[PDB]
Amino acid sequence: MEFLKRSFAPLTEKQWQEIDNRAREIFKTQLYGRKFVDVEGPYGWEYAAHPLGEVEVLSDENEVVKWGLRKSLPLIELRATFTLDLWELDNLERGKPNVDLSSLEETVRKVAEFEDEVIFRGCEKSGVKGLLSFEERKIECGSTPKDLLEAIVRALSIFSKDGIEGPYTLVINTDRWINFLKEEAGHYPLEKRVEECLRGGKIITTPRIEDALVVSERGGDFKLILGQDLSIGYEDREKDAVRLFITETFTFQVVNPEALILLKF
Amino acid sequence: MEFLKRSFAPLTEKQWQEIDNRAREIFKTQLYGRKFVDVEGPYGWEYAAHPLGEVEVLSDENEVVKWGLRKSLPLIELRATFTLDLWELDNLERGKPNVDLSSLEETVRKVAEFEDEVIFRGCEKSGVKGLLSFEERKIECGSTPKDLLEAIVRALSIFSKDGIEGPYTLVINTDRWINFLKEEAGHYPLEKRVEECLRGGKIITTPRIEDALVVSERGGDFKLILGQDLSIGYEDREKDAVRLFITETFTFQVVNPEALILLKF
Amino acid sequence: MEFLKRSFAPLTEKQWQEIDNRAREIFKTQLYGRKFVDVEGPYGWEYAAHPLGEVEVLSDENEVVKWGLRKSLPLIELRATFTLDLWELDNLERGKPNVDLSSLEETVRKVAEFEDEVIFRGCEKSGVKGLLSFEERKIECGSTPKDLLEAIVRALSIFSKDGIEGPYTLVINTDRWINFLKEEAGHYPLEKRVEECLRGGKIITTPRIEDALVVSERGGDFKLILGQDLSIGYEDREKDAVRLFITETFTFQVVNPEALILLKF
């Protein structure tokens, strides 16, 4: 019996595992950040903040004793609720393989969008700096696949200058990738061209961002620390419906900004 | 070779251990809080903050996802420097058992006073609430030892009402204790009277406070968490003098305010 | 305890290994010559000069005794200094994974540029002849990738005439390679065309040179002799900063000029 109080929910364990695998299957495809960022944890529920190794001196200079405070990044706890119908769920025990989980799917989609937004554009309230906030690592790129290849080559040259090794992955907005395919009446399979230019790299198309960027996957550059992973608990029961929730405690850190390059095409 | 960089200091290990035992001997008598408060740690240098188990909801009520932040108490790092004379220290190897350590003694006294002040009256900058801030647990007491005994009995009655068991310790200002002894021309050894009234309790006289209070020593009521205990490191060398420093990372927490009673005599 | 006097530096071994791996990682990408030239050594610090096997006759012809001197190539010793901040470094022990090493990176970049310049264009003061000094091995090439392929084929024909076997590597300036890609709207992946024409060869893009050339990697044609490899030592300490230096003793020799072909495109 854990934090989630799963036992007290008046639902069959078959429905429990069904919802579990449904949520996990949705999250595998909807978690864009985890596809390429490093993941650390779980550290348990008790992990409240992550140390930063920095000290700020509140004390003055005349006083001999230098007393100050250690900076740290507090974790973010998210909790989103939803409701299900007991009679609709009952059909699983009767043998119906299809059930209505539209509310659960919508909640999972929205929470995935929220966490992707937090990872990409940051949250000034929590002090987390988003990747797009690193404007200093920008390169102008033209509207043609030729200009895209030129930008990729120049980005790899900059990476080699800064000593950033492979593998390299290109994350591009899906609409812009589709537009590039529309403009590409050439002779070269665009995927194989990009892979050859990236020296065995991979392409990720996502709608979370509007532009393209190149990252390195040597590890230790983007750490997503999880206190408690994604989990579903039971809140309360009312009439013929059951209320559940999804909770997660996490934080994000960018170790080396030099491993990220942005394209302004 | 630790945080303190002790090896690089051009001082004999005999002088090192001499200064170590001198500082430890001073701290045993000058650390008033540790005489009665619970001590936890060390958690190492990396322990930046202590979790509080509380969550504050930054998110609004219309948005389904409830994202918030976990509260925690950041640790306080103190660092006080001092200087010693190489030629004066050299006499130890020649056989002189007496050396001048007045600067070190003064620094240790001042840092002990600072930490006692932080423990007792708190620090609003760090968010630590001092014991004297708990004004709700106050009892008026008269100027006579008879009134002191009456206040002790009433405080024990309140403790029994609130279910606080022994042992109990009375911490009283040294000047007020001396004044009570001056006023006491009675027939009862005052120490044995106080011990009998406290049911085997003990009395602690300190100049850090100006009044008297009664506490319980059942444990788990006042936790002083130490990341790195009191330690002395070497900063730099200049001409014929050597500069050292004393560093410490700590925090304080009051678990149960009901275990503390204050007297307003 | 070596030449570098690493022990006397008042820095943690963690910082030592961090700086070591940082410098090594930068050098792996910034050492263009070692990517394709043969490397010999280390011969230790005591190796002052490399024998040439040539004797010059100072004596006249009337005197029976023929006394002369043996020619040799003296080694070059480079030493570049830089400074770091002790307080900035202290954050590593506190847990900060990010430190400012901009001065170290700049020094490593500049020394890499200097050694690449010495390897490529030589140094008349030291008597080392640069590869670009071999103007007799020049071939004119046009501005089109077709002309580049023609020049590659003719260079391979000359190599076969002179009995130079594979593998062959093409080293081309990055800007000119990018311009060739810009001009290439053809149908053939340019990398695979170059590899096929070179019979499994590889392409290296570098900014150290402005033109393109073809070399052979059968070994024994370009020897870089190292007395002491790249190393970082500690010079002295001042106030709150520490001064380090990077030192290296080396020399370069071209055995067979017939294994090098230059393109004048």
Swiss-Prot record, chains A, B, C:
Keywords, ordered alphabetically: Encapsulin nanocompartment, Flavoprotein, FMN, Hydrolase, Ion transport, Iron, Iron storage, Iron transport, Protease, Transport
Activity regulation annotation text: Proteolysis activated by calcium and cobalt.
Major subcellular site: other
Catalytic class of the enzyme: hydrolase
EC number(s) on file: 3.4.-.-
Positions bound to FMN: R79, A80, T81, W87, D90, N91, L92, E93, R94, E235
Biological process, per Gene Ontology: intracellular iron ion homeostasis; iron ion transport; proteolysis
Residues annotated as signal peptide: none
Record note on cofactor: A flavin ligand is bound near the 3-fold axis channel; FMN is consistent with the observed density, absorbance data and mass spectrometry.
GO molecular function terms attached to this record: peptidase activity
Keyword Ion transport: yes
UniProt temperature dependence: Optimum temperature for protease activity is 90-93 degrees Celsius.
Entry note about domains: Has 3 domains; a discontinuous peripheral domain (P, 13-39, 76-133, 221-254), an elongated loop (E, 53-73) and the discontinuous axial domain (A, 137-216 and 259-263). The E-loop forms contacts between two subunits, while the A domain mediates contacts in the 5-fold interface. Pores are formed by residues 184-189, pore size can be modified by mutagenesis.
NCBIfam families: encap_f1
Protein name per UniProt: Type 1 encapsulin shell protein
Lineage: Bacteria, Thermotogati, Thermotogota, Thermotogae, Thermotogales
Gene name per UniProt: enc
